[PDB]
């Protein structure tokens, strides 16, 4: 088929840069899980593509009024006709574009910074009482 | 006396260690006696550990679909979130 | 006693948390209709700055501040397997599908409907998933008291 | 501990809370479709005495009644810069165009 | 014989009240917060 224009956004480890000491353009800017998966289905379903990033850098959704922007507006306006991304199947996003079958179905995990342990101590034990009183015992 | 200064500090330190477990045991059982335990259904609507629901082709399934008590409604939104 | 669940995170308001804006997380957080998460929506509504605009920004929130971040497991997997100053807490919440973007009314998606189940039996998504994801008190401190008292009685008279 | 956030006022029943008239947050609570503010504005509907009309009325009601006064935060600064008997409770609810 | 019998028994008198202090205080503290 034609070069189906792909709106996308770089994620970890989904869509990543192609890096070297020289110039790279368009499809040759970008690799990753989604892009090298896309290089398989270009042989499967018989199409080419152009990769474009999204501007606002985000998915983009309906505003206070109800107007799509970002990734959805690209497929609405047909300036992009594909979106190679983990585009999460959301029931409001079904109302301007159509989803295919999901390739991955995962959930919301919890990130928190790690305290990396501690040592036992007795200066900690000096603290539930005022530290001058511990010398007042003497 | 050269050994009177030996034994009394041991008495002073064996008194450090005996109240240590008295509160290690006591606040542990107090947390064990913090439990009511969880019986009431609003508290099961507070918890997410215990799976809870009813039988399919049951009236109370459709009733919690129909319920206006919001404790029922959020337990129904649990059971909508988990079909199991 | 520590936290590894969702209700006790709904208990605490002591760790800052938001999401990536224009994220499907936040797009579902406005659709979150159970009051344990409606109050975390009232948290995130009371904190527009806990909301981030970049996952990398929320990375620098958790790296530079005591910041819980509630995103999808995939990037949390790939980065916490490669960053050890950040801890993984508990499990997941749900599982939502990742559609492939077509404009509405695309019959070529019928071909896209076929090839996904092609890759489902051939398990290619997990093959690339292993390809593209890569892994990596007062109890003891008391020793200040008695040991000096045994030595003073040696060097007195004899 | 018991009060560290604005929702702590929405949970208690003892400390009233209202705002000076020509108050943007009175409007904003009508604007707030997040329901905890809707309960705080059904509070202020149910509590006409909590809603105050000028500056010293809320100052006196915080001193006399069981009442927290809601006000802008650098104004909360500027008053408590000079009024020392106070303590700022909780953090912000928002950042807002001014 | 008597100094070790009285030593271990006084050491068990050290044992027993730490348990009854656990019995009494966790009783009165749930009602102290109640």
UniProtKB/TrEMBL annotation, chain D:
It is found in: Postsynaptic cell membrane. This is Glutamate receptor. The record marks 3 as: Crucial to convey clamshell closure to channel opening. It comes from the Eukaryota. Belongs to the glutamate-gated ion channel (TC 1.A.10.1) family. L-glutamate binds at residues 25, 72. The record marks 30 as: Interaction with the cone snail toxin Con-ikot-ikot. It comes from Rattus norvegicus. Receptor for glutamate that functions as a ligand-gated ion channel in the central nervous system and plays an important role in excitatory synaptic transmission. L-glutamate acts as an excitatory neurotransmitter at many synapses in the central nervous system.
TrEMBL record, chain E:
It comes from Rattus norvegicus. The chain crosses the membrane at residues 8-30. It is found in: Postsynaptic cell membrane. Coiled coil: none annotated. Receptor for glutamate that functions as a ligand-gated ion channel in the central nervous system and plays an important role in excitatory synaptic transmission. L-glutamate acts as an excitatory neurotransmitter at many synapses in the central nervous system. This is Glutamate receptor. The chain holds residues 634 to 667 of 910 of the full protein. It comes from the Eukaryota. Belongs to the glutamate-gated ion channel (TC 1.A.10.1) family.
């Amino acid at each position: 088929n034609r070069s189906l224009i792909v709106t996308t956004l770089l994620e970890e480890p989904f869509v990543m840069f192609r890096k070297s000491d020289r110039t790279l353009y368009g499809n040759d800017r970008f690799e990753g899980y989604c892009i090298d998966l896309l290089k398989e289905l270009a042989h499967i379903l018989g199409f080419s593509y152009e990769i474009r990033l999204v501007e606002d850098g985000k998915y983009g959704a309906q505003d206070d009024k109800g107007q799509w922007n970002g990734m959805v507006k690209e497929l609405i306006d047909h300036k992009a006709d594909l979106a190679v991304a983990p585009l999460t199947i959301t029931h409001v996003r079904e109302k301007a574009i159509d989803f295919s079958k999901p390739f991955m179905t995962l959930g919301v995990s919890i990130l928190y910074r790690k305290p990396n342990g501690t040592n036992p101590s007795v200066f900690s034990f000096l603290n539930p009482l005022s530290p001058d009183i511990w010398m007042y015992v003497l | 006396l050269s050994t009177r200064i030996i034994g009394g500090i041991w008495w002073f330190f064996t008194l450090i260690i005996i109240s240590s477990y008295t509160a290690n045991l006591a606040a542990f059982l107090t947390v064990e006696r913090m439990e009511s335990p969880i019986d009431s259904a609003d508290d099961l609507a507070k918890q997410t550990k215990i799976e809870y629901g009813a039988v399919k082709d049951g009236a109370t399934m459709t009733f919690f679909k129909k319920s206006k008590i919001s404790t029922f409604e959020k337990m129904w939104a649990f059971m909508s979130s988990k079909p199991s | 006693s520590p936290i590894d669940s969702a209700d006790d995170l709904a208990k605490q308001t002591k760790i800052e948390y938001g999401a990536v804006k224009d994220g499907a997380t936040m797009t579902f957080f406005k659709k979150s209709k159970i009051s344990t998460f409606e109050k975390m929506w009232a948290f995130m509504s009371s904190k527009p700055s806990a909301l981030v605009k970049n996952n990398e920004e929320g990375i620098q929130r958790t790296l530079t501040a005591d910041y819980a971040l509630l995103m999808e497991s995939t990037t949390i997997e790939y980065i916490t397997q490669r960053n050890c100053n950040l801890t993984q807490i508990g499990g997941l919440i749900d599982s939502k599908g990742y559609g492939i973007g077509t404009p509405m009314g695309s019959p070529y998606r019928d071909k896209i409907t076929i090839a996904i189940l092609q890759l489902q039996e051939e398990d290619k998504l997990h093959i690339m998933k292993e390809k593209w994801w890569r892994g990596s008190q007062k109890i003891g401190g008391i020793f200040i008291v008695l040991a000096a008292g045994l030595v003073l009685s040696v060097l007195v008279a004899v």
